[PDB]
Amino acid sequence: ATPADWRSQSIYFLLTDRFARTDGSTTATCNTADQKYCGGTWQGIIDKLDYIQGMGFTAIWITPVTAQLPQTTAYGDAYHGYWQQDIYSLNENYGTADDLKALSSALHERGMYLMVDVVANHMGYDGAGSSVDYSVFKPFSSQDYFHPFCFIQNYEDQTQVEDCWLGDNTVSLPDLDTTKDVVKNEWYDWVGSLVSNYSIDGLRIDTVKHVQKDFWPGYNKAAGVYCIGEVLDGDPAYTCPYQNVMDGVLNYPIYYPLLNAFKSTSGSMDDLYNMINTVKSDCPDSTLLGTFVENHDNPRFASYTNDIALAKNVAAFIILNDGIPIIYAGQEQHYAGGNDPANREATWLSGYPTDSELYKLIASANAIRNYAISKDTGFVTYKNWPIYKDDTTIAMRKGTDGSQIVTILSNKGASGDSYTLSLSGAGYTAGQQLTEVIGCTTVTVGSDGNVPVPMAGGLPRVLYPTEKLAGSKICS
Ligand SMILES: C[C@H]1O[C@H](O[C@H]2[C@H](O)[C@@H](O)[C@@H](O[C@@H]3C(CO)=C[C@H](N[C@H]4[C@H](O)[C@@H](O)[C@@H](O[C@H]5[C@H](O)[C@@H](O)[C@@H](O[C@H]6[C@H](O)[C@@H](O)[C@H](O)O[C@@H]6C)O[C@@H]5CO)O[C@@H]4C)[C@H](O)[C@H]3O)O[C@@H]2CO)[C@H](O)[C@@H](O)[C@@H]1O
Ligand SMILES: [Ca+2]
């Protein structure tokens, strides 16, 4: 599917090994500290598609599918999919080629998209860099396809970052020489084939800053579908420019300020407001970035604060910001694991309750987003604009004038006092009735165009014109 098609989607990101088993168990042991395969499979994802769609997601991102190193290393099994050895075969721990195909067609039947994570930067090996046996890799069976062994000592030296090896002496990640034409040619041919064989709709590309920029334009074109890249860097002057060589990138620039604003009642709304504006002006297209606050490489939000009102607000931001929303499986169940491996918890242990607090908030936020784009073909290309901020509040506006959504977010927390915010700048007309779509109550615009928003419990408030909800099932 193209970049234009993808602007309207919302993604549920999951680790195949940790989401759902074929036997549907909700109590099978999965101690994250063991770093072993816990048993998730592609068939299990199919069985729980109602759980996922019920939150209003239109797509899923799944970790890498290729066959991995077989060993249990000192860092555990390659359950996460990032240590490949044979790119022409699939990881059998998750099922067969037919299962993968079954998945794509079960998604498509429901009007949903499939996004697959891919690695071009490196392969994986159980042992020290000097001792690698290149004959185990397929098809790159020789040391001549790879860069000479070196580890990345200085992450500020771009040359080292691209030409030296990620990993270490325990689990080493042999780095492909992506400047060689044989390497380019093989990867360009594989990526088009993988996409056509499994009917994939879009790709998440790992380790993009570790491969020279000029490789990417031809990979994105060979893939023929939207590519969103992982560039792990918080500086918009470093990451955004990658949008000149690939459709989109993950929004790490917004991640830092967003987490800092909501992880405590003293978080800064100023840093978040300024970064929204910077990304808006300085990235080639903000509407093609992926917004997130949790993933498998950082502590979960609840490891920072167990306050449920702060978790509601950060989740509302993610769905309603510019770009594509991305929630990480377990976020909706309020999971609190710390750094890898503790943030790779098995979703099934939660029992998949559809009446959890964040499951409901997410469902309501995705519901208004999905309905609005149904009615306003400009919603996805209108650039989100922060219209107000104070020490504990930020409010934003997105959507064509007359149909705009106005979202009011707070970091006061679950103890927050009850008061009335008089919000200016919303753009609605005098006397207009508005529905607050999270708690389903109504508010009326004052005669001077200001909106009297009832604040309490640190809850987020999402406003939309009552007349426009006509015929919808929202707040019915
Ligand atoms: C040492 C670890 O080794 C393995 O760790 C695994 C991991 O479990 C697996 O998931 C995969 O890991 C994946 C890989 C490798 O295929 C890459 C992508 N993620 C990578 C980035 O592609 C890379 O750039 C670097 O990312 C660096 C970044 O390049 C550097 O700039 C700084 O990032 C800065 C950023 O520059 C700055 O702006 C901001 O303020 O601070 C952050 C810390 O640190 C980051 C690491 O924390 O590491 C990330 C984990 C993926 O999302 C990630 O899941 O492989 C690694 C390496 O074997 C073990 O399993 C772990 O238990 C063990 O603790
Ligand atoms: Ca490299």
Curated annotation (Swiss-Prot):
Cofactor(s) this protein cannot do without: Ca(2+)
The UniProt note on the cofactor reads as follows:
Binds 2 calcium ions per subunit. Calcium is inhibitory at high concentrations.
Can you cite an annotated GO cellular component? cell wall-bounded periplasmic space
Entry's Gene Ontology BP terms: carbohydrate catabolic process
Applied biotechnology: Used in the brewing industry to increase the fermentability of beer worts (including those made from unmalted cereals), in the starch industry to make high maltose and high DE syrups (starch saccharification), in the alcohol industry to reduce fermentation time, in the cereal food industry for flour supplementation and improvement of chilled and frozen dough, and in the forestry industry for low-temperature modification of starch. Sold under the name Fungamyl by Novozymes.
EC class: hydrolase
Binding residues annotated for Ca(2+) 1, in chain numbering:
N121, E162, D175, H210
Gene3D superfamilies attached to this UniProt entry: Glycosidases, Golgi alpha-mannosidase II
CDD domains per UniProt: AmyAc_euk_AmyA (cd11319)
Q: What is its EC number?
A: 3.2.1.1
Cellular location of this protein?
Answer: Secreted
- Which residues does the entry assign to the active site, renumbered to this chain? D206 (nucleophile), E230 (proton donor)
Q: Which UniProt keywords apply?
A: Calcium, Carbohydrate metabolism, Disulfide bond, Glycoprotein, Glycosidase, Hydrolase, Metal-binding, Secreted, Signal
Q: Glycosylation annotated at which residues? A: N197
The record lists its disulfide bonds as C30-C38, C150-C164, C240-C283, C440-C475
UniProt: substrate binding residues = Q35, W83, H122, R204, K209, H210, G234, D297, R344
Site feature location: Transition state stabilizer = D297
Q: Catalysed reaction(s)?
A: Endohydrolysis of (1->4)-alpha-D-glucosidic linkages in polysaccharides containing three or more (1->4)-alpha-linked D-glucose units
Q: Does the record bear Acyltransferase in its keywords?
A: no
Q: Where does Ca(2+) 2 bind?
A: D206, E230
What protein family is recorded?
A: Belongs to the glycosyl hydrolase 13 family.
Q: What does the subunit section of this Swiss-Prot or TrEMBL entry state?
A: Monomer.
Protein name, please?
Alpha-amylase A type-1/2
Source species: Aspergillus oryzae (strain ATCC 42149 / RIB 40) (Yellow koji mold)
| Gene that specifies this protein | amy1
